[PDB]
């Protein structure tokens, strides 16, 4: 009886709005992907959102899109404790990412990010860790005091809220993914949604080969772009796990909260659930290990997986990976290090019953009192 | 009834192989674009394929790893007559487009090749327009000869044939479609093959954020990559659809002869799928007006649709638009501008049938006949 640590959670109502599609003779550019747009617009309470093929497709137009570039406002400031895509796109932008140093939530450290900035700096890109806010107020003031753009990689947090306000539209613009293990799933997929209506228009283009509606059978196009569109079929999904995102980020918490009660006080790690503030999509339900067991996380995790828990790690620091260390060779974070050398994510998703979390909680339990 | 110029074609088994897929715990990155990848490889005869969100993408995944970049080698030669996405890409890659002639049935053509190919040459791109294939034969040899690489941008010709053997195996790469309207859909899709192992590989990786496999908990990044993967979802329905490919084609085949039953000998215009000399596609059906036409464009094409015939032009020659100016400020082609102001696309697709065509065929010439 095997547990991935998330699974697509799809249901009657979800396969048949995907038929429904298929009998029509729109699969693509159609009206089921606008009708998706309006309905996270309405969801979040922003005024634009964009859907593309993918998440990283949707932060690429962002990095691309935000503002112009220029080889004097070429370094960004973000965390590395996120998946290499968020810094990927930015190399593939022509920025230098610049990593801060995070907190004991994984979360992007909004202390450590005065001491960073310089001439170059353009933006904060944040990444809100398991779905949980970063400290948006800060961030917010951080970067008007200093005229940088900020941007939210939200991919963990449709749902989540700041101070009882839902994540989206507090950044110049906000990143979500849909991706299969994602709160809700168009199989796989994106957003930006922003407030900034030239922004929305600009990435609109970048989507779509920069093509402009003119004569009905001729166009105009001013600018490069893309085929990152997101297809009728998985927008008809989308709408469709949309309706009952809630629903589904309560079965979510419930699971979180099975879980804390079971590990509440015991001796071998902290579950960082009991140290919410604001509600969470709850994407990830990390635990972090005790210092005593870093030496052992391999035997730990190899442990898990035989007793059916396919327990994850996120993340790896992203400047640890080849091709940043001979870019930029960056000094390691130590805040990142005992972060990741910390982490397991154990199965969390809408699927999964009180017994199930019973057993995996306490199979945990027993994997770690192995050792000592 | 309102006749778009083209349609999917799904079934009850295309509807079957979705519902499968949404029955199962694997929405994206199992089996099932494996499956794919080879029943292409098996379709077409080639050792490895890529499936990919859309055509574009697996263009600029194509245009950025063929070749590292290099400021020296930094002109690819293309045809004017295609899509955009086939020059935005090039763009994307740092790339400078050289705008080729073509022939008057729409392909790249293959002798004014020659007087373009200078220092800074990497490769040539061709657009198999309509799905009928560019002269390979010619295309590979002119590449042999100055150290080019040739790259074919397929997107409408899955199913077409040179000298008897399907389009896919000539270029050292070739690019696929399936959007919604193509030969074959996935509703949004496309495809690179190639017979080069070491470039299937570095496209692969390209397609997936660079991620290499470790063990099951960690990774290794060597180079950027994107995420531009196919869905288990369109994957599904993109194998349903290829297992009738040849039967589409078929249709599409039999639809284009009676349009040219229907325009045999007529003092309108020229049709160019009764030139054809091997198997087409017919991704499009395009008539090419008299020069006496050119002038009215815009009125018989509203009359067209006025009569329910969604109508189209395949296509406005690229550098004609404001963005290419800006940059290279292009002075229009003959053949080119030409083939424009001439071609309209009829409707052509898997589920047009006899009474449509004749019906749309018979419009058509009422149309030009009252001008």
Same mark, same amino acid.
């Given at each position: *009886?095997? !547990?991935?640590?998330?699974? +697509?959670?799809?249901?009657?109502?979800?396969?048949?709005?995907?038929?429904?599609?298929?009998?029509?003779?729109?699969?693509?550019?159609?009206?089921?992907?606008?009708?998706?747009?309006?309905?996270?617009?309405?969801?979040?309470?922003?005024?634009? @959102?964009?859907?593309?093929?993918?998440? %990283?497709?949707?932060?690429?137009?962002?990095?691309?899109?935000?503002?112009?570039?220029?080889?004097?406002?070429?370094?960004?400031?973000?965390?590395?404790?996120?998946?290499?895509? %968020?810094?990927?796109?930015?190399?593939?932008?022509?920025?230098? +990412?610049?990593?801060?140093?995070? *907190?004991?939530?994984?979360?992007?450290?909004?202390?450590?990010?005065?001491?960073?900035?310089?001439?170059?700096? &353009?933006?904060?890109?944040?990444?809100?860790? @398991?779905?949980?806010?970063?400290?948006?107020?800060?961030?917010?003031?951080?970067?008007? &005091?200093?005229?940088?753009?900020?941007?939210?990689?939200?991919?963990?947090?449709?749902?989540?809220?700041?101070?009882?306000?839902?994540?989206?539209?507090?950044?110049?613009?906000?990143?979500?993914? !849909?991706?299969?293990?994602?709160?809700?799933?168009?199989?796989?997929?994106?957003?930006?949604?922003?407030?900034?209506?030239?922004?929305?228009?600009?990435?609109?283009? !970048?989507?779509?080969?920069?093509?402009?509606?003119?004569?009905?059978?001729?166009?105009?196009?001013?600018?490069?772009?893309?085929?990152?569109?997101?297809?009728?079929?998985?927008?008809?999904?989308?709408?469709?796990?949309?309706?009952?995102?809630?629903?589904?980020?309560? &079965?979510?918490?419930?699971?979180?909260?099975?879980?804390?009660?079971?590990?509440?006080?015991?001796?071998?790690?902290?579950?960082?659930? +009991?140290?919410?503030?604001?509600?969470?999509?709850?994407?990830?339900?990390?635990?972090?290990?005790?210092?005593?067991?870093?030496?052992?996380?391999?035997?730990?995790?190899?442990?898990?997986? *035989?007793?059916?828990?396919?327990?994850?790690?996120?993340?790896?620091?992203?400047?640890?990976?080849?091709?940043?260390?001979?870019?930029?060779?960056?000094?390691?974070? &130590?805040?990142?290090?005992?972060?990741?050398?910390?982490?397991?994510?154990?199965?969390?998703? @809408?699927?999964?019953?009180?017994?199930?979390?019973?057993?995996?909680?306490?199979?945990?339990?027993?994997?770690?009192?192995?050792?000592?």
């Amino acid at each position: *009886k095997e !547990f991935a640590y998330s699974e +697509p959670c799809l249901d009657k109502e979800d396969k048949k709005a995907v038929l429904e599609v298929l009998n029509s003779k729109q699969l693509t550019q159609g009206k089921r992907s606008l009708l998706f747009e309006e309905a996270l617009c309405e969801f979040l309470g922003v005024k634009h @959102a964009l859907v593309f093929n993918s998440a %990283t497709s949707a932060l690429l137009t962002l990095y691309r899109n935000f503002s112009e570039f220029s080889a004097d406002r070429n370094e960004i400031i973000t965390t590395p404790i996120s998946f290499v895509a %968020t810094a990927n796109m930015l190399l593939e932008s022509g920025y230098t +990412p610049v990593f801060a140093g995070i *907190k004991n939530d994984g979360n992007i450290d909004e202390l450590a990010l005065e001491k960073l900035i310089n001439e170059r700096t &353009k933006a904060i890109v944040s990444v809100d860790y @398991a779905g949980k806010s970063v400290e948006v107020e800060s961030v917010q003031k951080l970067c008007k &005091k200093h005229s940088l753009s900020f941007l939210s990689d939200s991919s963990h947090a449709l749902g989540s809220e700041y101070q009882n306000k839902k994540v989206g539209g507090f950044a110049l613009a906000s990143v979500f993914s !849909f991706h299969a293990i994602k709160p809700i799933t168009t199989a796989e997929g994106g957003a930006v949604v922003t407030n900034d209506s030239e922004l929305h228009e600009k990435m609109k283009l !970048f989507r779509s080969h920069g093509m402009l509606k003119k004569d009905f059978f001729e166009g105009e196009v001013k600018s490069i772009g893309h085929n990152f569109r997101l297809n009728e079929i998985q927008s008809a999904l989308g709408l469709s796990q949309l309706k009952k995102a809630p629903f589904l980020m309560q &079965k979510r918490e419930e699971a979180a909260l099975t879980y804390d009660r079971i590990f509440k006080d015991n001796p071998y790690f902290t579950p960082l659930h +009991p140290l919410l503030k604001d509600k969470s999509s709850n994407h990830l339900y990390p635990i972090l290990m005790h210092q005593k067991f870093f030496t052992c996380k391999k035997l730990i995790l190899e442990s898990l997986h *035989k007793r059916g828990i396919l327990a994850q790690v996120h993340y790896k620091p992203i400047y640890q990976y080849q091709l940043y260390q001979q870019l930029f060779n960056t000094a390691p974070l &130590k805040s990142a290090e005992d972060f990741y050398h910390a982490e397991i994510s154990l199965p969390c998703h @809408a699927n999964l019953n009180l017994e199930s979390v019973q057993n995996i909680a306490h199979s945990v339990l027993k994997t770690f009192e192995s050792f000592k």
